[PDB]
Amino acid sequence: MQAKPQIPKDKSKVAGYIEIPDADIKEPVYPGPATPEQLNRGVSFAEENESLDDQNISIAGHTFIDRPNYQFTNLKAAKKGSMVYFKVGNETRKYKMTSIRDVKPTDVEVLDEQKGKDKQLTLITCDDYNEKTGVWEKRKIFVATEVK
């Protein structure tokens, strides 16, 4: 958290906090390149090429079985108007879950030039583990666009 929300090289501190009252979520979002250790402690961005000042902010949801009460556990209770409060740097970024669907690792047409939006918070919540190869089949994607 600092002036003009951006992502530093330190992958240990918090860039912003994710607050979704509808999902009982008020947890720290870790700014990272979706590297293993980043997800093991919390949620991370999809890449490090994105930014908090960028139009594309994509948070990879690290769903886990061991833990019953972590960040994206109850995010499945969210809906179109869950009021997503991203407390980043200083400001409270409110997003609305207007575009909700789920995709698969074999769907490379969703993570693309989906321009035309404002600051969109792409919640990539990977659910359903495929033990046969080690992937997550259901990539639930909640595109919460910065709401008025």
Ligand X SMILES: *[C@H](c1ccsc1)c1oc(CO)cc(=O)c1O
List, by residue number, the catalytic residues.
Answer: 62, 126
Residue of 11, 22, 27, 34 that binds ligand X (CB under 6 A): 34
How long a stretch of residues is the chain?
Answer: 148
**How crowded is residue 61: how many other Cβ atoms within 10 Å of its Cβ?**
23
Tell whether 47 is in a known binding site.
yes
Helix H segments across 21-146?
36-41
In angstroms, what is the minimal distance from the CB of 126 to ligand X?
3
Distances (CA, A) of 91 to 2, 6, 75, 86: 10, 12, 22, 8
Tell whether 137 is in a known binding site.
no
Residue of 62, 87, 93, 140 that binds ligand X (CB under 6 A): 62
Residue of 7, 23, 56, 139 that binds ligand X (CB under 6 A): 139
The conformation of residue 22, written as its DSSP 8-state character, comes to: G
Smallest CA-to-CA distance from 44 within 63, 62, 56 is with 62
Site string for ligand X, 98-117 (x = CB under 6 A): -------x------------
Determine the Cα–Cα distance for residues 84 and 111; give it in Å rounded to an integer. 21
- Under the binding rule (CB under 6 A), the answer on residue 60 touching ligand X is yes
In angstroms, what is the minimal distance from the CB of 122 to ligand X?
8
- Under the binding rule (CB under 6 A), the answer on residue 124 touching ligand X is yes
- Under the binding rule (CB under 6 A), the answer on residue 136 touching ligand X is yes
Please, are residues 56 and 3 in contact by the beta-carbon 8 Å criterion? no
- Under the binding rule (CB under 6 A), the answer on residue 46 touching ligand X is yes
Cα 88 to the chain's mean position, in Å?
Answer: 13
Q: Which residues bind ligand X (CB under 6 A)?
A: 34, 39, 46, 60, 62, 105, 124, 126, 136, 139
